[PDB]
Design a protein around this ligand. Sequence first.
Ligand SMILES: *[C@@H]1O[C@H](CO)[C@@H](O)[C@H](O)[C@H]1NC(C)=O
Ligand SMILES: *[C@@H]1O[C@H](CO)[C@@H](O)[C@H](O)[C@H]1NC(C)=O
Lengths: 638, 56, 16
Amino acid sequence: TVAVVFSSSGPPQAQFRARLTPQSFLDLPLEIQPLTVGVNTTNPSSLLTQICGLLGAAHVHGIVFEDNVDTEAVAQILDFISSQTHVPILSISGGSAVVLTPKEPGSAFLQLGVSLEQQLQVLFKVLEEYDWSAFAVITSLHPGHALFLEGVRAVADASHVSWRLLDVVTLELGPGGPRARTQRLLRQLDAPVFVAYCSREEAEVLFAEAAQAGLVGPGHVWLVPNLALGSTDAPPATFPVGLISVVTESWRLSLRQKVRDGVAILALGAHSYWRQHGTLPAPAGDCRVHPGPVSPAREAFYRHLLNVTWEGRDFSFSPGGYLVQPTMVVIALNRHRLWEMVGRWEHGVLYMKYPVWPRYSASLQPVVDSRHLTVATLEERPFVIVESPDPGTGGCVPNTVPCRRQSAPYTKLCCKGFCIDILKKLARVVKFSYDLYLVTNGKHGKRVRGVWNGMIGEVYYKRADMAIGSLTINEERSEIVDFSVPFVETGISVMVARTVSGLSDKKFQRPQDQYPPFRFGTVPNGSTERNIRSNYRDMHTHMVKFNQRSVEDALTSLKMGKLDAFIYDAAVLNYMAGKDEGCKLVTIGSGKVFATTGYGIAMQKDSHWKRAIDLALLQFLGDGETQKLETVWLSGIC
Amino acid sequence: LEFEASQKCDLVTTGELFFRSGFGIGMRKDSPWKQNVSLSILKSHENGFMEDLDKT
Amino acid sequence: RITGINDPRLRNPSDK
Ligand SMILES: *[C@@H]1O[C@H](CO)[C@@H](O)[C@H](O)[C@H]1NC(C)=O
Ligand SMILES: *[C@@H]1O[C@H](CO)[C@@H](O)[C@H](O)[C@H]1NC(C)=O
């Protein structure tokens, strides 16, 4: 048998009947007969008398609690009762589901919640991803403030980033006290990120005071644990929009649904113990007698009661009465005063709905940071390399940047390469922030009747602000999108198998050879095939039967013997001939470069960045760091 | 240096380049002539005219 | 030739 108790809400007579009705709900192998009890008011004698009477006149094996208006100092009574009469109980919701760390020795409470350590871990896993590192910690004079202050420091030393702390302050945010002193202390602060710990009344007082002393505008960000924010279904006034909290799963289920989970976990625990010994332990419910030394049978049943799994939800209780390894979900206050999901957490890796933090204003109209820009690119093997994050610690190796392939759902890869290092140094010197995302359409750029795809398309239509990578310079692009000075020098080159004297040779100029027809490369839809077609019609006509899949399959075709000559860029062709199986070489060499242009950073027309960072590129080229990067990333054997 | 080394006699360039830079036309700050000069230079690079001038 | 500064066989991993 399993008991059920309600408290302090709209009278759930219909809910009580609906809970009592499924005497066989088929939610587990075997179903003990459920019974329901309801207390009118929450009080010490009321609760004590009801539970003692029910469990002494019913002979019950387990009992499931349901919470109330969320007042404190109620879980202690449950701990006391469970320790005395040795009956396992379980709290499911409200204020009684707040973790009690030093529980009684022989008690079996098992309240589903999360300790401050796990919540702080999740919060610092969302601070690291957006890279704030401000740490303005504010705590009121609360009973548990010392534990929070110890935990934040303990976790601060358990990560990679320095986490430069700025200030921690403790103030009397109670119903009665000097408001002027707290006003003075709040008026003197400077940090873009705040972490606060207090109670709901303390939260409302502190937020009202912060609104008075101008700390709630679009400049700062606030974070609170689940202890504050109260009901979750009625956000009061003076609560800043953009508040971030972390709550466990099932923050939107029904009261009836929660009880169904509570009875299921007890039923599986008995069933799991049933397979071991084929019995259900007898109840021990003499509240009046209050007997019982340490009992091994109930101890073994409780030990087997810890781990449970059903319906694809892992409930694993630590020795302390709180569950370990849950799947928390981060929530935030939308622009219309309504809690909404922002980012999940599942086996230690954090996700987010937004690649950047939306910042709102007093009259909404989401402001955009002036010193932040979006950069488009894609993968070119010598220059941009994409690697999936390692299963090591969630985030990938340092000296790499997060980078996501846009297409709502996203997978966070992290891109590496030469142009990435250039971008990192540019961000270091010009003092700006950025986010990087790969392109999905055609590689580099084309004009199919005014529709430009690729990075040039994403920049020309004002969906991006730069476009770094392997992006050469030509007459067409330079008309519609700006450009900066070249930093890597390329052209057109031919790779052969280790026979021609340039493009003007009759081998390529006159495709009228009888026995041997020569074969070309020309991976289409790129820069080179535009110039080649525009300047030599016959070659374009005769180049239809040319292998065109990538810069990878062309090497295989050349090594096989199905193709004779490759035409492509120079900076990638000569590098590709540096590290090769054997030694495949090109024509005469750097003397054979045709239409010698250079790589560049595209920009929206008339952008104020252009002048600022062209000088930085020139400075970087002047003193020779580019030579070091080239010798690190662009060296070969043969 | 390379033109004179390969032109007259008995002179040889040692090693290779160690610090690279380009050549450009100078103009006053924010002059209106810049865009057209750059476009014409680029189109002459890609035309092949600069190759003919070089070989000449 | 396995140098100490950087070998392309070492800088770029090979199969053998
Ligand atoms: C833990 O889970 C296993 C697997 O079902 C079960 O046999 C065991 O009773 C559970 N409890 C303990 C204490 O091992
Ligand atoms: C540059 O060329 C455009 C047309 O190509 C012309 O309208 C403009 O006057 C030129 N710029 C100057 C400074 O003459």
